[PDB]
């Protein structure tokens, strides 16, 4: 069953931006309803935990700029696994998240902190979301080769040979 | 020129007939062979034009299928342009043809761009265009001027790229 | 970065050769056939080298992660960013291999091994045929 | 520009067409 690749997949939510608008405060809230947000990530678990509790270079800059991002670490350091964190922000139109997974290897002999490993690239441009360059290059080259093949077969069709002259047109 | 001792006669700054300082020009086997071939064919064309004044085929000479056909065209060019009185020119042209690293003008331009993008000395650039070295240290030892002036990683990258650029015969 | 640098220089020379063949085809008068063959063969073998070198360094290209510059402004150059970002094939090639697969259309595996044995048999047969007659 | 005001655009709104009854009419084209 034909599936559109998620790298080119682009979601638009006019109702959400009309109701709430685009801001770093609710950029994760905007991302929550997208298909790219896995329901198995620990961010959703933290979200239900918060809901139950209520019912009952630029990395350091964005680190020190917002306190909710702080709360994100102090709620995310306890849970290791696939997590969604912000990468960088330039207002009022550009935001990009950092898709990384954490394995807090607390074993004896490792003086390093929890291991952070990239998984995917996500770019929020306007109200749209974008998600390999190797594929782009090979696709461009293969389409170029197809066009070249068509041109060369047409040119060879145009070619006419005679023994007494050689090849002419 | 281990210590870049080029003397007064071959200074880096040259005074031309116009009186303006120019960078000293150094050509490897490929560049010199292409330049001399172009000059010879231009002189032959001028001679033919003059003969027509007193009283098509030239496209096949520059484009050679093989080394032997190129040598035959070279012999014909020397017969029709030099007169056969200059054996040293024939020996130099044969040495250029047999050990020309690069036959196509575009590839020679690529080699020139790769070698002189770093801004090295023209002597070193011409030597690198003449010599094919497997390892950076081999070139550095065989070219004492390149020592202490180019990083080993850059030299290795340049040498590997040049080896890849060599057109298969 | 070294692998992508080599890819850059080789693709740049390939694009230069493409520009060449372009501005010698754009002339109102067609040059001699032989010059066209030489240009075709040189550019096409250069494309082969491009493919081979891109094959060699897949790991370095894959390991790299794309990210826009902090200094690069997206508000004014979003069109330029989207131009390079998009990667979907041209449609005509798409329905081209769709019709190709339509025409082509444990069983598949044993046909695959039957193709293996036909290939090996044909190779051996032509080796024998070449050995039969002295070609030197 | 940043405030999306309803029912006043130069060009027809995509959200207007989404909220328009033509969407469900196409969805309920079988019922037609």
């Amino acid at each position: 069953m034909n599936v559109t690749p998620l790298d080119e997949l682009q979601w638009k939510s006019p109702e959400w931006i009309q109701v709430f608008g685009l801001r770093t405060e609710n950029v994760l809230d905007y991302f929550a309803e997208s298909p790219f947000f896995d329901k198995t990530s620990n961010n959703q678990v933290i979200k239900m935990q918060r809901q139950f509790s209520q019912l009952n270079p630029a990395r350091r800059q964005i680190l020190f700029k917002y306190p909710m991002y702080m709360q994100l670490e102090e709620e995310l350091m306890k849970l290791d696994g696939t997590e969604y964190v912000l990468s960088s922000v330039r207002e009022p139109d550009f935001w990009v998240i950092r898709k990384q997974r954490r394995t807090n290897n607390s074993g004896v002999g490792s003086a390093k902190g929890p291991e952070i490993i990239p998984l995917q690239d996500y770019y929020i441009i306007g109200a749209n979301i974008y998600q390999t360059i190797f594929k782009i290059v090979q696709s461009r080259l293969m389409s170029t080769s197809y066009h070249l093949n068509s041109t060369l077969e047409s040119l060879y069709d145009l070619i006419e040979f005679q023994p007494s002259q050689g090849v002419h047109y | 020129a281990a210590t870049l001792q080029l003397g007064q006669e071959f200074q880096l700054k040259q005074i031309n007939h116009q009186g303006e300082e120019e960078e000293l020009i150094a050509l490897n086997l490929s560049e010199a062979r292409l330049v001399i071939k172009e000059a010879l064919v231009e002189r032959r064309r001028a001679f033919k034009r003059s003969q027509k004044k007193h009283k098509a085929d030239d496209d096949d000479f520059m484009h050679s299928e093989t080394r032997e056909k190129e040598l035959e065209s070279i012999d014909v060019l020397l017969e029709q342009t030099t007169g056969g009185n200059n054996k040293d020119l024939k020996n130099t042209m044969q040495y250029l043809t047999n050990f020309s690293r690069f036959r196509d003008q575009e590839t020679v331009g690529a080699v020139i761009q790769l070698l002189k993008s770093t801004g090295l000395h023209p002597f070193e650039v011409a030597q690198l265009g003449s010599l094919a070295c497997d390892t950076a240290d081999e070139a550095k030892t065989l070219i004492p001027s390149l020592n202490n002036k180019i990083s080993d990683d850059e030299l290795e990258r340049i040498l590997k790229e040049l080896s890849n650029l060599e057109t298969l015969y | 970065g070294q692998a992508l640098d080599a890819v850059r220089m080789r693709l740049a020379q390939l694009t230069h050769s493409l520009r060449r063949i372009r501005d010698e085809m754009s002339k109102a008068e067609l040059p001699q056939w032989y010059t066209l063959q030489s240009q075709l063969n040189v550019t096409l073998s250069q494309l082969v080298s491009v493919t081979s070198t891109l094959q060699h360094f897949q790991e370095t290209l894959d390991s790299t992660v794309v990210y826009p510059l902090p200094k690069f402004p997206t508000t004014s150059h979003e069109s330029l960013v989207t131009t390079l970002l998009r990667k979907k094939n041209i449609p005509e090639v798409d329905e081209w291999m769709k019709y190709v697969r339509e025409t082509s259309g444990e069983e598949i595996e044993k046909l695959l091994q039957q193709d293996r044995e036909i290939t090996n048999w044909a190779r051996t047969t032509f080796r024998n045929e070449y050995g039969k007659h002295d070609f030197k | 520009k940043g405030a999306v005001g309803p029912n006043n655009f130069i060009w027809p709104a995509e959200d207007a067409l989404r909220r328009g009854m033509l969407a469900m009419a196409s969805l309920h084209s079988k019922e037609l």
Binding site: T4, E8, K12 | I112 | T83 | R18
Partner: peptide, 25 residues
């Protein structure tokens, strides 16, 4: 040096083929 730089071969007129489909909520 560099014999000649490459001519700008930008094609902004290219319409692109981005698939758009997950717009409905």
């Amino acid at each position: 040096p560099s014999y000649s730089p490459t001519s700008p071969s930008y094609s902004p007129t290219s319409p692109s083929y981005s698939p758009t489909s997950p717009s409905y909520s």
